[PDB]
User: Fold this.
Amino acid sequence: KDLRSPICCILGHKLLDKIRQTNVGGITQQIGATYFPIDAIKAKTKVMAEYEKQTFDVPGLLVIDTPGHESFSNLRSRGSSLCNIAILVIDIMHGLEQQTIESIKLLRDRKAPFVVALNKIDRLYDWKAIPNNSFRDSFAKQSRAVQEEFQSRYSKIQLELAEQGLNSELYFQNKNMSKYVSIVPTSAVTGEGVPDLLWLLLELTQKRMSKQLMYLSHVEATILEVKVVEGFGTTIDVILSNGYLREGDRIVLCGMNGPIVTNIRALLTPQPLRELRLKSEYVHHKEVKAALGVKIAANDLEKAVSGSRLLVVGPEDDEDELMDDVMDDLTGLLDSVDTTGKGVVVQASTLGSLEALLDFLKDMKIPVMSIGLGPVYKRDVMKASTMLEKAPEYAVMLCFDVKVDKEAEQYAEQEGIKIFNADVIYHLFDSFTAYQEKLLE
Assistant:
């Protein structure tokens, strides 16, 4: 069979610094991701033969490495196209951070599958480490004492997980993955448990997600970043999870003001050699194939929507129809709102973030007049102005993980339009409630 390389991401507070380490093969830094060829994974999971059967039927594994929630930029309905499984990192020493708690809620709302990497086991007192060893092997070789510290901290964390509504189990004791998330103890410092983690990701993707890895005729590529690069203008960073992209390809994209159609001018990956980075930070490719994180340079990318997908226009294909098709997600979001009624104006970083926020605002019966994506401008604030006479209360903008232009802020202040901006939804809610209540007293 020709199976796709599965794609995963890490939700962490560096663990991936340890996984990406190789000792004198073929692990490559890509754009916004790191790719692990299957042979490298074999080498790194060699010690797992002691405990498990091994399966190597995929070309490799792609790890989305950016620091945010970029793996959830698209609609949840296309989630698996962007990321097959998440790794929720939890500190064994000081337990759950708040960021961890949010990540748990986000994962539940996205309905995304994940495992837990229970990191920092080295910090257990008198931990005697065996570099890059499997967990069970190093653990059996610890003192009874060390084994007991592990059990204590582990149980504390299981409690803290149960408090976020999660039941949890060590991965080799999970017989009910539908009920229990698997826990893999790791050390970013020593590398211990990393073989276990690789084996487990391989296992879950190849065994319980075989259909997701099945060969696909058509391209699957999702926009994660829209970034200016001097010499290229506005570029886009994408995850190509299926198919091929070629220099010169006619592509259509979802944009803030409608569909964009353009032609690929360059396909770019990072330049690994220091000396060559003096000449260019990138390697140009005539053609690339999944699974990879790649930067695309093309004209007219300025209004591109993060989380949107790419369609390649074939000689046979109708461009106008495809242009309509690409919009479907954003348009579906637009249909969820009544532009006529009284309501707030909403603006979000990505299709996924916009969807998560809209779902929330509907859950709270909070009406929304207008919808938007990306950085906030004065023209965007102006949308809420109409609200002021009809309702003082709804003349507000609810913004998620976006930037507000100074001009927009001054305009809002001078107009008495409230701008609430946060990177966690409940912050927005609390601010809005507070505002309404203030208006009441």
The first strand starts at residue 7 and ends at 11. The CA atoms of residues 241 and 291 lie 5 Å apart.
